[PDB]
């Protein structure tokens, strides 16, 4: 079978909250079968755990935020993108503060830390959400769509009237998540960043963790990791948002100027329309329409 996966060892990392500027300590731990990804605020007594599920999403204005009562976990989408990309079913993610650390603004540091610790296959079948009908959400000129597809592929299109400009398609039948998507960093325009700083936000922002863009150009002296790094980052973000379903996807996702808000609207509509999806396992990994790297 395609088996469930967890971590082989615990992973400790430290970083900065993009908006808070706070140092945050991160511990990833193995978790039993059918746990999913569970975030834990270990700075609080008692600790507050929030399963990384569509139903626990609170704020989607700037990133994906999990909420339980007055307790938040901000910016889950890069770490979740890493977990999805590597096929991690089950993990406890402990944080010492309300925001996952931004690291370099990509999923690269997370896929390295996870693969350094190694994966452990577990003695249960891996559950997949299979798209069986088209599900589309629109709000104005923004669109997010799930389409049936025997595999996992993600297409995105953004539209900025801008000089440093975008569309991209990635199929996990030939594309490496790690090599082609994982390293795509977060981006922001000077205009917006100075307004957020004016609001006492993006306090952790730096060329170390974000692509900073003018009206004309990338201000980061060391440049881009990919000619299409901007749209590849939106694909990274979308994979993290889709993983809030709590299982890997058999299907296609198409985003047109989509963001965390509309992605979460797509997940809620899909979950509600039970004719549009089913939970599948594969007793024979040879006949499965997807595959993951050796553990
Ligand atoms: C708008 S979006 O791109 O769809 C949202 C995005 O993908 C989302 N997942 C995300 O990554 N994020 C949510 C929004 C956030 C916006 C952002 C905030 C701050 C900065 C910065 C900076 C900065 C860099 C260098 C200096 C020199 O002193 C000063 C400041 C850059 C971007 C970036 C992180
Ligand atoms: Zn992002």
Swiss-Prot record:
It is an enzyme of class 3 (hydrolase). The active site is at residue 260. It comes from the Bacteria. InterPro entries: Ribosomal_Su5_D2-typ_SF, UDP-acyl_GlcNac_deAcase, UDP-acyl_GlcNac_deAcase_C, UDP-acyl_N-AcGlcN_deAcase_N. Zn(2+) binds at residues 78, 233, 237. It catalyses: a UDP-3-O-[(3R)-3-hydroxyacyl]-N-acetyl-alpha-D-glucosamine + H2O = a UDP-3-O-[(3R)-3-hydroxyacyl]-alpha-D-glucosamine + acetate. Its EC number is 3.5.1.108. Its cofactor is Zn(2+). Keywords: Hydrolase, Lipid A biosynthesis, Lipid biosynthesis, Lipid metabolism, Metal-binding, Zinc. It holds the Pfam family LpxC. Pathway: Glycolipid biosynthesis; lipid IV(A) biosynthesis; lipid IV(A) from (3R)-3-hydroxytetradecanoyl-[acyl-carrier-protein] and UDP-N-acetyl-alpha-D-glucosamine: step 2/6. One of its GO terms (molecular function) is UDP-3-O-acyl-N-acetylglucosamine deacetylase activity. GO terms for biological process: lipid A biosynthetic process. GO terms for cellular component: membrane. Belongs to the LpxC family. Catalyzes the hydrolysis of UDP-3-O-myristoyl-N-acetylglucosamine to form UDP-3-O-myristoylglucosamine and acetate, the committed step in lipid A biosynthesis. This is UDP-3-O-acyl-N-acetylglucosamine deacetylase. It comes from Pseudomonas aeruginosa (strain ATCC 15692 / DSM 22644 / CIP 104116 / JCM 14847 / LMG 12228 / 1C / PRS 101 / PAO1). The gene is lpxC.
């Amino acid at each position: 079978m395609i088996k469930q996966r967890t971590l082989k060892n615990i992973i400790r990392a430290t970083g900065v909250g993009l908006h808070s500027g706070e140092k945050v300590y991160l511990t990833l731990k193995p978790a039993p079968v059918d746990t999913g990804i569970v975030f834990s605020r270990t700075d609080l007594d008692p600790v507050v755990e929030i399963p990384a599920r569509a139903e626990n999403v609170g704020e989607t204005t700037m990133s994906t935020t999990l909420v339980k009562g007055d307790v938040k976990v901000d910016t889950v989408e890069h770490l979740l993108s890493a977990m999805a990309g590597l096929g991690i079913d089950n993990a406890y993610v402990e944080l010492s503060a309300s925001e996952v650390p931004i690291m370099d603004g990509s999923a690269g540091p997370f896929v390295f830390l996870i693969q350094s610790a190694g994966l452990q296959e577990q003695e249960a079948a891996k559950k997949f959400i299979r798209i069986k009908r088209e599900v589309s959400v629109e709000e104005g000129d923004k669109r997010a769509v799930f389409v049936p597809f025997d595999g996992f592929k993600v297409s995105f299109e953004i539209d900025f009237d801008h000089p440093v400009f975008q569309q991209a398609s990635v199929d996990f039948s030939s594309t490496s998540f790690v090599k082609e998507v994982s390293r795509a960093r977060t981006f922001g325009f000077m205009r917006d960043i100075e307004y957020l700083r004016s609001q006492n936000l993006a306090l952790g922002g730096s060329v170390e963790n974000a692509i900073v863009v003018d009206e004309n150009r990338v201000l980061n002296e060391d440049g881009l990791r990919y000619e299409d790094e901007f749209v590849k980052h939106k694909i990274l973000d979308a994979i993290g948002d889709l993983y809030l379903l709590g299982n890997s996807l058999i299907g296609e996702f198409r985003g047109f100027k989509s963001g965390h808000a509309l992605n979460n609207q797509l997940l809620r509509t899909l979950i509600a329309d039970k004719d549009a999806w089913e939970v599948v396992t594969f007793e024979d990994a040879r006949t499965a329409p997807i595959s993951y790297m050796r553990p």
